Design a protein around this ligand. Structure first.
Ligand SMILES: CC(=O)Nc1nc2cc(O)ccc2s1
Length: 343
């Protein structure tokens, strides 16, 4: 057939042609990303004389209305004066072109998933991990701004991008999967490896779910492997319990999805209902991180800024980000005051 006068494919995406001239302004170079939303292209702005990333949304009502929500969250974000907003990807402008909504961003570099691939999944250093952590904590402090109160809701290595390949600066991308605070509309949220216990349990949730994901992300950036690599939801909770033990009963008594993972015994205590896992809380983060044995797999033995003390600081901060209780889970402001970041 012919879709959108031949500009679209049979899947509502714009057929990207390299070297195409848009509105006597944008020079399309090449595609750098893809997803259900549509496509992301690298291109040169002839007016501002700089490279830009252009997120071309699918020519369809559903994907259009989601991108419009993202536009309004990004435009609501750049109303604020603070310098913390530049840990979020900056939307420069947006427009309709051949029936696709196009969001124009600053051009960023590789994502943190690409970075882990570059290490052959052995992780980067604790020194670089700390700079990613301090920057993400500030990013989350900014999202916690009362007038924003934005839950990114899908934080993962893929959605954190380096500004530049020769620097440690990072920005968060993709606020099309946001679940902004308030009335609970969504329950199946967050990508599984980084999905919080309150989400797994079917419980109310808030901005604390992004801090959980960050805890997970940060350990992964130093080990090189995902911390809780569940193939399904049951396996995900089981991998969480391996490291952190059985979740507190006060939470499980309130959890609608309690019985998907756990069973309440005659004595009133909760247990794993069986379905190959280490016993509750015996896969220690102290040992996953290699606190006293020279880091993950001993690969950081003798590296500067990888002393036992440095590792205990990191461990502690991470354990505070993986508190089972979303109420006492460490908040952005206090995370930034942790001795892991203290000069
Ligand atoms: C799904 C999604 O929004 N992906 C995005 N990828 C990039 C890459 C950039 O360099 C700048 C902005 C964005 S947004």
């Amino acid at each position: 057939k012919v879709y959108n006068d031949g500009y679209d494919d049979d899947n509502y995406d714009y057929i990207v042609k390299n070297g195409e001239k848009w509105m006597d302004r944008y020079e399309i170079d090449s595609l750098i990303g893809k997803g259900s939303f549509g496509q992301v292209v690298k291109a040169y702005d002839r007016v501002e004389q700089e490279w830009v990333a252009i997120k071309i949304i699918k020519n369809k009502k559903a994907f259009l209305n989601q991108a419009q929500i993202e536009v309004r969250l990004l435009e609501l974000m750049n109303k604020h004066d603070t310098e913390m907003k530049y840990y979020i990807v900056h939307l420069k402008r947006h427009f309709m072109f051949r029936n696709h909504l196009c969001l124009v961003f600053e051009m960023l570099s590789y994502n943190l998933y690409d970075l882990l691939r570059n290490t052959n999944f052995r992780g980067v250093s604790l020194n670089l991990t700390r700079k990613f952590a301090q920057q993400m904590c500030t990013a989350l402090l900014f999202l916690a701004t009362p007038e924003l109160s934005i839950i990114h809701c899908d934080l993962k290595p893929e959605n954190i991008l380096l500004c530049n390949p020769k620097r440690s600066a990072i920005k968060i991308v993709d606020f099309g999967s946001s679940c902004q605070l308030g009335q609970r509309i969504y329950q199946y949220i967050q990508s599984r490896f980084y999905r919080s216990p309150e989400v797994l349990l079917g419980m109310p949730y808030d901005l604390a779910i992004d801090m959980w994901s960050l805890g997970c992300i940060l350990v992964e950036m130093h080990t090189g492997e995902p911390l809780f690599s569940g193939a399904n939801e049951v396996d995900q909770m089981n991998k969480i319990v391996e490291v952190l033990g059985i979740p507190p009963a006060h939470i499980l008594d309130q959890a609608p999805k309690a019985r998907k993972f756990f069973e309440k015994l005659p004595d009133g205590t909760w247990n794993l209902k069986k379905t190959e896992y280490k016993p509750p809380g015996t896969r220690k983060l102290h040992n996953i991180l290699g606190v006293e044995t020279g880091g993950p797999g001993g690969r950081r033995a003798g590296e500067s800024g990888h002393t036992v003390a440095d590792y205990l600081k990191f461990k502690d901060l991470i354990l505070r980000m993986l508190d089972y209780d979303p109420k006492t889970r460490i908040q952005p402001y206090y995370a930034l005051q942790h001795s892991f970041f203290k000069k």
